[PDB]
Ligand binder design. Structure first.
Ligand SMILES: [Zn+2]
Ligand SMILES: [Zn+2]
Ligand SMILES: [Zn+2]
Ligand SMILES: [Zn+2]
Lengths: 479, 479
């Protein structure tokens, strides 16, 4: 019970009522960063969090202004502030920086939610919390504060100096955060010894994991324009060229129904499969039956465990998200859309270069479009990019985290990679020159970016205790 | 000046202030039939119209209830009432039934409108009225009442017995109206001698037309379903099959970028081009430059006048409208949609059979989908169908209408067909066994189903006077 972790573990149980309360208030402020009309909510969310920091012991609190929303439509809307804080300033202790994000994906009841997405429903009988942002990423984020509180209530010494970096643009490209970290590497973040992030999930639903790899993400829109305004599809049908028709062809040329990306040049950039990397992949626990459970269907593209895992983790993927600018409500509308935007993204792996990938994508789309012999205008542009990240899971942090997991969940965690992405992870590693650990709180069926997003209370509590032991053990590790 | 048409023409000018006023109130009630939340507005619109009928001389007014919204999502919403009325009951006069529709396409400022779509802006200096529904179809509809008023104010004898049939589901499949006409053929409509419809436009912007043909319309949705809910595109990317990916392929197989429909079986049903029909096509005035003006671009599929006309009028077309169930807002969303609906319609011509076309469409979509080797579910269904219609433009009505047009616009109208559709036109002809005339009020660049829908005041006034002379001349024709 290192400096009595049992004391801390006990307080974590006792304080569940205030933790729940804190988490309810947070979830109720709909910090949807992608929604301009809710930007003010995003600020209230940041404000609420800074208030929790301050009520707990945190100091040197800074609501950092990245500036005005820019990049590639903004009415001079300010960006959500990045929240920096410290807890403790003992020069003999290690300093751990924790990062998370307080903005959240959009959500509406009518999307199919069983409960209202921004009313956090807590069911201690089933042991689940249902609400948008509860696993991605407001639950895990607030967990760091809960943990500070538990050390406090248990009268136990906090094992490290905590430093916080909470942004509110993660669901919207993490704009400008990149620059902040680099700018502050020899400033607010000067003394950092390590970075921990809780912003992903267990592979499955039964066994905890530690994550040593993330895919990157390149998000594209293909824009096709024709007439100057929408056209009655009857008056002009068969006589003017249709952006929607070209677009089905261009979009339909990016990837097949088996998952094979059809863009020339990508496969060449994909790092080959090594025996070293192959070692780690075995002994994982996972089956397609689990994938089917999370999916809610039998629609996997692979049956072999090795295949499912490798195609989630280390082979790229291309997904097609939807069309902007056409007719998307229910029923019928007889219209020829004037200007449409096809949405699609690529999950990047080593060793894919962002730049080259974008060129390849443009080259492919331009060429396909030109082969249509269409009078329409067309071009493909990048909306946002985020780097992939791979690390060796043997350094001090993973060891500390491994013992922590073992302590709480009674088994050693699998070592896994992630299909998902956390864009700044690489920026933390390189800019600060420290190791990064990913410590998933929730399960792989939590429904992030979907309806009925849930966090199991067992993962909530288990994850907090795991965060507590991890900080404790890390503080004890010789390096 | 048949029974002083000049008197009637003069009153039509003098009464422009009340006509404008009447038209403003109507346009302000947003009878968007496709929008459940606005259904109540649709009823107010019907109510408003019945009030105008009654204030003018109309009698035997009936707000006919088609029943509860049915077919292929409805919370037992009642349908908009069909409005039947008569003006005059002289047994020695001919009876003309006029049909139009008081519901309208959806509209929002943010779609790109220069003015607020449901605030009718009337600019007598430019001579335009801007508002949703002003040409399609509320302007023309109300014109019939204006005309009754003008005869009244001019103290001139109304030349026929007018009978009205105004529905509020035209933009939503004209549900149940079909049955009403057939049911009432030997009832409310027993004495009808002729049917006139003002619900389309001049071919171009310079020369009035009379319309003797309409294309039909079959509206389809292809439904592809996979997982039970949306999936994080990163967690599941490359590993589960994507409905959106299949859908781009199925949809992208329906028609090329030249306008060629790719569904087997359709061409065979297309009636061959005759010398008779070819006669009428010549002497039309139209050029691609005009098409470009209305389009706002240079994106025609044909340069030859004959080709543009024949591909608008008598060859089928396939348009692709948009996708329901995916991501359609601006920016980026990393999601794999669970269940998507691809929207597309076919403009039918003789001699395409509705039934067979639907089979061909299903056969094609099913086969394409199956060739994808996808674990997903898929099926294609018809949302609504409306018949094509072709008539000989030489009967009493067209002659009457021709002289009327000549009188007002000083030239004889071109005889044209329509790319657009008015579903019940055939039902009127067959069920009542009379001729049908289409008397376009507006121009072909009015922007129906688009942003900034306009009606030129010259067409408004010209069309009213043309409607007046047409009723007068028809009343005089020996048959
Ligand atoms: Zn997220
Ligand atoms: Zn996340
Ligand atoms: Zn319409
Ligand atoms: Zn119409």
């Amino acid at each position: 019970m290192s400096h009595s972790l049992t004391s801390v573990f006990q307080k974590i149980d006792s304080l569940k009522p205030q933790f729940f309360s804190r988490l309810t208030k947070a979830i109720q402020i709909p910090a949807v960063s992608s929604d301009e009309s809710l930007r003010s909510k995003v600020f209230d969310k940041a404000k609420f969090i800074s208030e929790q920091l301050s009520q707990s012991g945190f100091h040197d609190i800074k609501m950092v202004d990245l500036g005005i929303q820019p990049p590639p439509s903004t009415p001079n809307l300010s960006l959500p502030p990045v929240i920096l804080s410290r807890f403790g300033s003992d020069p003999s202790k290690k300093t751990v920086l924790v990062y998370g994000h307080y903005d959240v994906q959009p959500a509406q009841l009518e999307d199919g939610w069983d409960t209202e997405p921004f009313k956090l429903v807590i069911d201690e009988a089933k042991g689940i919390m249902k609400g948008r942002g509860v696993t991605d990423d407001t639950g895990p984020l607030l967990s760091w504060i809960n943990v500070v509180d538990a050390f406090k209530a248990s009268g136990q010494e906090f094992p490290v100096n905590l430093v916080t970096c909470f942004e509110g643009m993660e669901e919207s490209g993490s704009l400008k955060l990149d620059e902040l970290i680099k700018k502050e590497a020899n400033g607010y973040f000067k003394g950092v010894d390590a970075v921990c992030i809780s912003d992903n999930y267990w592979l499955g639903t039964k066994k905890p994991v530690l994550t040593y790899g993330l895919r990157g993400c390149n998000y594209y829109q293909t824009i096709i324009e024709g007439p100057s305004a929408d056209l009655h599809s009857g008056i002009f049908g068969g006589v003017v060229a249709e952006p929607m028709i070209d677009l089905m062809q261009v979009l339909g040329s990016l990837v097949d129904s088996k998952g094979k990306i059809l863009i020339d040049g990508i496969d060449e950039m994909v790092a080959p499969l090594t025996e070293k990397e192959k070692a780690l992949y075995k002994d994982i626990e996972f089956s397609v039956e689990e994938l089917n459970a999370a999916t809610g269907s039998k629609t996997s593209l692979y049956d072999k465990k090795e295949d499912i895992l490798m195609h989630r983790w280390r082979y790229p993927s291309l997904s097609i998200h939807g069309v902007e600018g056409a007719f998307s409500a229910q029923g019928a509308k007889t219209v020829i859309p004037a200007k449409v935007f096809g949405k699609f993204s690529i999950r990047t792996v080593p060793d894919m270069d962002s730049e080259k990938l974008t060129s390849l994508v443009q080259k492919h789309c331009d060429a396909k479009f030109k082969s249509l012999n269409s009078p329409n205008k067309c071009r493909t542009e990048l909306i946002h990019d985020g780097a992939y990240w791979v690390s060796d899971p043997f350094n001090a942090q993973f060891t500390a985290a491994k013992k922590a997991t073992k302590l709480v969940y009674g088994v050693d965690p699998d070592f896994t990679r992630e299909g998902g992405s956390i864009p700044i992870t690489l920026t933390f590693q390189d800019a600060l020159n420290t190791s990064v650990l990913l410590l998933p709180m929730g399960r792989g069926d939590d429904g992030a970016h979907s309806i009925n997003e849930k966090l199991d209370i067992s993962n909530f509590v288990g994850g907090m205790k795991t965060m507590a032991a991890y900080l404790q053990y890390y503080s004890e590790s010789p390096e």
